[PDB]
Symmetry: C5
Subunit: 168 residues, 5 copies
């Protein structure tokens, strides 16, 4: 038989992992809601509260190097991360700033995984409006969608447990 064909969606136990969340501070009310959702979902999957490390940077452009150095600091302290969730909220304005920051930041986070040698979850919102970002953090008045921060927390746990440096 084909190995893994039809294997059901499993539950991941995050009890032994350490997760870093590093967030930008622009659009702070949205950021905070995304972070809280990631935290709650990881705690629901077993991640200990003392094993969830928070760090901040000024803007989304600072996420890649901030994440690199956050990983470095945690390893040097003897509390290395197994996975990290950089979180930022970018909202289109009148210039092309949104596009150039979003593009360079997204590629940099993707390409950073090889350098920090761990999964880096994509927690950057790249919205055309603030209303879109509120909805994607589960805090729009209409509660039209759900908090994507929860999905990022779940992905952090799965990626660490199945593919982390210590997984095999």
């Amino acid at each position: 038989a084909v190995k893994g064909l039809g294997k059901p969606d499993q539950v991941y136990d995050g009890s032994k992992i350490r997760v870093g969340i590093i967030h930008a501070r622009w659009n702070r009310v949205i950021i905070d809601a995304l972070v809280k959702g990631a935290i709650e979902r990881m705690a629901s999957l077993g991640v200990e509260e003392n094993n969830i490390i928070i760090e901040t940077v000024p803007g989304s452009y600072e996420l890649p190097w901030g994440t690199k150095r956050f990983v470095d600091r945690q390893a040097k302290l003897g509390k290395p991360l197994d996975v990290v969730i950089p979180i930022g909220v970018l909202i289109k304005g009148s210039t092309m700033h949104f596009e150039y920051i979003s593009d360079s930041t997204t590629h940099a986070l993707m390409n950073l995984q090889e350098k920090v040698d761990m999964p880096v979850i994509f927690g950057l919102l790249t919205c055309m409006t603030e209303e879109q970002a509120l909805a994607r953090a589960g805090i729009d008045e209409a509660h039209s969608m759900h908090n994507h921060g929860e999905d990022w927390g779940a992905a952090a746990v799965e990626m660490a447990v199945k593919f982390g440096k210590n997984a095999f």
Copy 2:
């Protein structure tokens, strides 16, 4: 009427190769159809079912690192892959998320080949609509196109047999 996918240049015999399929879970019904098509075409070319290994990740952005680590795990187990097919279905929504994920994921999969030292087949659908994705997986009500997963399985066998690490 014209002329897309070309006829395979020859009948590739995939009997000695091992292929990994690693797929995201967004748009799961479409994903499953693409995966089945890839498996069916590879089996028709002689790849043994025991040498087809399936792995999964949450979303398309996790495909590049997941593929890197899936390759590592298979090699560490003494069952190295000769070729891998990362499969993901991205459908344009309201924000620029589709574009940023599609762009960084496509470039990362292309650039991953030198790192995993094997061919990585491009199995990402980057569609504007769900109907377009359905049609490209061969599951639209009208069956207007065909299952592109089959083409990806054929490409995996050809790339592994002609250019894989063990080909020469």
Copy 3:
């Protein structure tokens, strides 16, 4: 006079850091206002006047290699930078030059951080019009925004203090 106003996130003491500002010279009135705002904000955070080093390049495309060699020069002199702020102003014209320079410069500055081994703040304005650029340097007739040079100065201090080479 420490009047304050922008986002919490701790108060960073930049008294021990050395910051380089390297700026392009096209759109010089805008550039000069941006630079002056960055200097003023860093001075308000304790960065000493003799530890703010200024260098210039002709255009924004020269920022990446200019910054690489400015970092080299400062280290060879025994006055290494802890963080650098490349500043340039790109304004859309009639051709696609704006887009090609903006895109390659932004990615190069982001990817330069690993090479110079320090944070590189994104001080590149990528505006569709001159008025947009003026507004973002706090010098438009309407004073419709604020000088973004100040934000860059603040980010330079924070990134150096929290994540610079000498921070831990």
Copy 4:
């Protein structure tokens, strides 16, 4: 379609060089016409028929790794290439697949030159319509333009003779 460009700055003698042509098979009638024109132009510049090596891959996305491994096999066989011409034809469809494959393939072929340590000629057509592609291979009904494969053969000989690994 109004075409510029010049003839070498000389008549290059390609009698001592070995050229690889590696083509995708999507849009095969157009591909064949392009390949033929490159061959004819190279033969007219003195490249021996025994020193023109043809290889194929399924689609344009397979060109970069296909080229990398084709160079490797030729070198391993003691018949190393001095230059290679990857040829593919991409025609916009309904989704963004055309854009994502074109973008990642073009960058990958450009960046591959350092890795294969030889010139890699850009023989990808990135057309909006089939007509446009037919015209650029010299086979549209009206013969409006000319076969661009010829220009690619000419550029392969010039780059090999002037800048190939063995040129100096």
Copy 5:
């Protein structure tokens, strides 16, 4: 109306440097005007006529590898370049070729600097029309703008003098 080509922020003594100019041959009347302007300005800054080295390639896509190998050739000859100005003229046509060549060539030239270990001036015009390209080479009927080749010559001298390999 004949006058000094001096500019107050361009006062650099180029007497000790060697500059390479490597140009594409597509749109040759415009190319020649740009090259001429760069030579004229560098001569006005003291660069000696025997220290300005010219090389050519077929199209703008060949500029990155042509420049890499031109640098190698000059160093092997014991006449190493201190800075190089790749010049090419791209004019939008009916397909996406203009965009794919422009984008990959611009990124490759920017990233080539670390590899050739010298400044690489951005001398590529990426115009929508021939008239725009003519104007930017100072040869439109109207003489609406000025020859941008002059600015590139000035930047080449400044970058070599201030940041070249032998500057410090």
